[PDB]
């Protein structure tokens, strides 16, 4: 029954995930009708909103728990498949812990040592002759027993810990599990203050596909954007340097005349002033400063004003806009190019759609019958599903090449028709 419940949350991960979003929406909709005298609730003559909030918070925490369990059941085995597969390939075809012994960096590799000594290293990679093959490959050049010592309702009474410490160190490094734990922590602290449930509305970026593409444009050049803002800060620092050296007397943000002075005479305060109303004014720093009507620094203050405008207000904004629009156009170029390359050419061979279309529809025959991504994967899965004794000469040759990783069997620049053109051949 436990296994059925776990398979349920794994299989129903996306549905419960979509459900918690709308519970968060319902919470934050009821949050609009709050008041003060302390943050009470005053409805439009309906006293049912508080029990709905009380039960929906409990549902939110519960369904966050179930989504976390679904993620733990479902997506964790895949990334561990990738990890143990990588570790096995590094042990076999590189001999990492035999020869390399990697540095303090590559903290994955430094972490992936205690797994090596375990019995259940090849737990999900479906290749168990790893220790034996490494013993065959380095049994005499480095050692034999060196390799072996390097390598090797009644359910809750015996289980490994050596492999599982490594596994938990893996899962506590994964990003989506960390996000779901953050989601759970916000749903729990929603009990402490119901305003914390508003954090869960930011899951729309993960949820919706098109919104992820809306966000990719600004994400595509975030580094250059932050450099633009840093340059803006440097420029405003130079401007307030020029002000603090010269233009302090105009920096009078007091009331009408004959008043106590509320001035910017220091350097830090003037820098905060320029960053706070020099750029956030729509017109520059001269708007929020006493006008230079007949001063010796009239032309210099005018130069200061217009240069501040035409550089800070204009150029850096236009650069940010150009960055986001260039991200848009470049992602359009990316998808245009992938459609181009897939239409022109075989994914497998790279012939081009020129040799086959002599015959009608031939390129599509090539992609949809012979040199298929699907049929190739199904032959892979077939031979993983098959037994090595039952292999033909063809399948034995190919399985040899698979587990020793050649990829020469794959066609490239050739095909059955190119070999066997209908010319008595």
């Amino acid at each position: 029954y436990q296994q059925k419940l776990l398979n349920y949350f794994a299989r129903n991960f996306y549905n419960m995930r979509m459900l918690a979003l709308f519970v968060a929406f319902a919470i934050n909709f009821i949050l609009l009708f709050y008041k003060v005298s302390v943050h009470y609730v005053l409805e439009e003559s309906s006293g049912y909103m508080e029990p709905t909030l009380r039960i929906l918070a409990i549902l939110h925490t519960i369904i966050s728990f179930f989504c976390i369990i679904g993620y733990y059941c479902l997506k964790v085995p895949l990334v561990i498949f990738k990890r143990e597969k990588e570790v096995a390939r590094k042990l076999e075809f590189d001999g990492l812990y035999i020869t390399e012994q990697p540095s303090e960096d590559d903290i994955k590799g430094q972490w992936d040592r205690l797994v090596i000594n375990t019995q259940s290293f090849p737990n999900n990679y479906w290749d168990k002759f790893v220790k034996r093959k490494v013993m065959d490959k380095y049994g005499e050049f480095y050692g034999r027993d060196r390799i072996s010592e390097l390598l090797g309702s009644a359910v809750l009474n015996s289980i490994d810990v050596k492999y599982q410490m490594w596994k938990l160190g893996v899962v506590f490094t994964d990003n989506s599990f960390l996000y779901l734990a953050w989601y759970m922590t916000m749903s729990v602290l929603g009990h402490y203050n119901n305003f914390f449930f508003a954090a869960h509305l930011l899951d729309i970026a993960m949820g919706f596909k098109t919104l992820r593409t809306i966000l990719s444009s600004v994400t595509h050049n975030g580094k250059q954007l932050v450099l633009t803002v840093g340059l803006l800060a440097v420029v405003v620092y130079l401007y307030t340097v020029v002000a603090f050296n010269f233009f302090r007397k105009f920096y009078n943000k007091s009331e009408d005349g004959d008043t106590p002075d509320m001035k910017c005479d220091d350097m830090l305060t003037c820098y905060m002033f320029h960053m706070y109303v020099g750029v956030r004014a729509g017109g520059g720093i001269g708007d929020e400063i006493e006008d230079p009507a007949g001063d010796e620094y009239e032309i210099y203050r005018i130069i200061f004003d217009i240069t501040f405008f035409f550089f800070v207000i204009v150029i850096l904004l236009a650069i940010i806009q150009g960055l986001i629009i260039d991200a848009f156009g470049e992602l359009r170029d990316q998808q245009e190019q992938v459609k181009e390359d897939m239409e022109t050419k075989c994914f497998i061979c790279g012939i081009g759609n020129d040799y086959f279309d002599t015959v009608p529809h031939g390129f599509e025959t090539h992609t949809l019958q012979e040199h298929n991504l699907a049929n190739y994967l199904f032959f892979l899965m077939y031979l993983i599903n098959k037994d090595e004794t039952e292999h033909t000469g063809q399948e034995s040759y190919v399985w040899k090449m698979y587990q020793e990783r050649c990829w020469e069997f794959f066609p490239a620049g050739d095909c059955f028709r190119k070999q066997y053109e209908d010319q008595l051949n």
Partner: protein
């Protein structure tokens, strides 16, 4: 058993003579697991497929393909074929079965988005021999994924 096939001594009443199991005036469903037979059919379908694809242009065999069309329609989804460079320095076909679990798991769920992301990242980033092992890693992770999704 009137609409699915015609009715003769040798089509329907043949089955009803094979279905002479019970004396309760009934028939159990064990006649179907008894009849088993399509494992022969796949291999003969593959035999005729290899014979046709490698050796076309023969009216005499084309006659028999007309006979075996009804079985080839049955075995077409499960019968895969691929081409690979051989030990004799030549491309040739490898005819091989396809399951339905891998097909249904490969087609409908989220794995199509994974294939789209795979093709996109491959052809954008690209590589000389950083293409086929990426394809095989995608295939192995996907095989594990379809296995895990079959497990529910």
């Amino acid at each position: 058993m009137e609409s699915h096939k015609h009715y003769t001594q040798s089509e329907t009443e043949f089955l009803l003579s094979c279905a002479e199991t019970d004396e309760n005036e009934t028939l159990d469903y064990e006649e179907f697991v008894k009849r088993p037979a399509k494992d022969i059919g796949f291999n003969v379908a593959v035999l005729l497929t290899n014979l046709s694809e490698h050796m076309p242009n023969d009216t005499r065999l084309q006659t028999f393909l007309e006979l075996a069309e009804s079985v080839l329609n049955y075995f077409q989804p499960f019968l895969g074929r691929i081409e690979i460079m051989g030990s004799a320095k030549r491309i040739e076909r490898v005819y091989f079965e396809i399951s339905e679990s891998s097909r249904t798991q490969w087609e409908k769920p989220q794995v199509k988005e994974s294939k789209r992301q795979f093709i996109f990242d491959v052809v954008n980033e690209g590589g000389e021999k950083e293409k086929m092992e990426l394809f095989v890693n995608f295939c192995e992770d996907t095989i594990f994924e379809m296995q895990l999704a079959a497990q529910i």
